[PDB]
Amino acid sequence: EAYTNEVQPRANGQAQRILEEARAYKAQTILEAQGEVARFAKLLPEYKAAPEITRERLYIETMEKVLGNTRKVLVNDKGGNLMVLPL
Amino acid sequence: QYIREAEAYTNEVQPRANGQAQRILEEARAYKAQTILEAQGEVARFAKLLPEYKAAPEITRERLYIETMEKVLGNTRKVLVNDKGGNLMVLPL
Amino acid sequence: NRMRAEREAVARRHRSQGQEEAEKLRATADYEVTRTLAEAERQGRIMRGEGDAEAAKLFADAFSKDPDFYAFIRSLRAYENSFSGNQDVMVMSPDSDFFRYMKTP
Amino acid sequence: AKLFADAFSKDPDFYAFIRSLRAYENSFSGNQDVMVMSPDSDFFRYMKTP
DSSP, rough: OOOOOHHHHHHHHHHHHHHHHHHHHHHHHHHHHHHHHHHHHHHHHHHHSSSHHHHHHHHHHHHHHHHHEEEOOOOOOOOOOOOOOOO | HHHHHHOOOOEEEEEEEEEHHHHHHHHHHHHHHHHHHHHHHHHHHHHHHHHHHHHSSSHHHHHHHHHHHHHHTTBBBOOOOTTTTOOOOOOOO | OOHHHHHHHHHHHHHHHHHHHHHHHHHHHHHHHHHHHHHHHHHHHHHHHHHHHHHHHHHHHHHHHHHHHHHHHHHHHHHHHHSSSSSOOEETTTTTSTTTTTSSS | OOHHHHHHTTOOOHHHHHHHHHHHHHHSSTOOOOSOTTTTTTSSSTSSSS
């Protein structure tokens, strides 16, 4: 006696642990989902107001970001030569 | 003395082998138990997620696809070079 | 010196045999941990699926409105995320799509 | 495999889609794996003028 009566607590605590743990992910998932859902539900009405302008600004803005970090070449076309030079 | 030491070594290693045998035997059982239980969890995820995909296949596929691409793209060396110029080298290490 | 050996052999046997039992019980302990670890992970996946499954209906309707604009804003964001590092090289040309006002008027 | 077979036979294409996507991140986790993309590439579609 008293051997099995102590095994259960160990698992019991761990069981409630995962429950709350997974419930947090689901709670955060729902929350984050709603936030992202609301994020696009606010840009879509304004996007429809001026699709070309919003697309152009986002595109030009997105471009200066990627280009700002990544290197550039701007080499003329019709030439099949480059050095990947990886590591 | 070589014989005396030899008998000790033989008698010493034999019990150790038996103990190692149970360890690999038990590990296989644990693997079997872990794989069956792990499969059940994944099955539930797929079963619950499948109706959501069936509701909006294109949106779900597109959302997952873009998300998936971003991660694999972020941890790799993108090139973004016109396929015309297929003159490259491997340079392995 | 022969008597020493025979007792010494028996001694190692008694010492080595006890070690063997340790291995047996030690291995069984590992199995119990694996039985509970997988069990917990199973319950987690069930709930962890409901989470993304519950949000999937939300994303579905939000982006169903305009999946082309959502893919555009999401892909633009994904580029900034993917190209966050300086390990890539954008081989463009002065007449590319972006480089439209880079020419003389 | 029994559970996988029954649970995935409901929709083979969708399981392949989800499983194929997950496999990519597990393999390309390291930066050593290079990807020679192109502007024409299907994914890099919105990176151009709208």
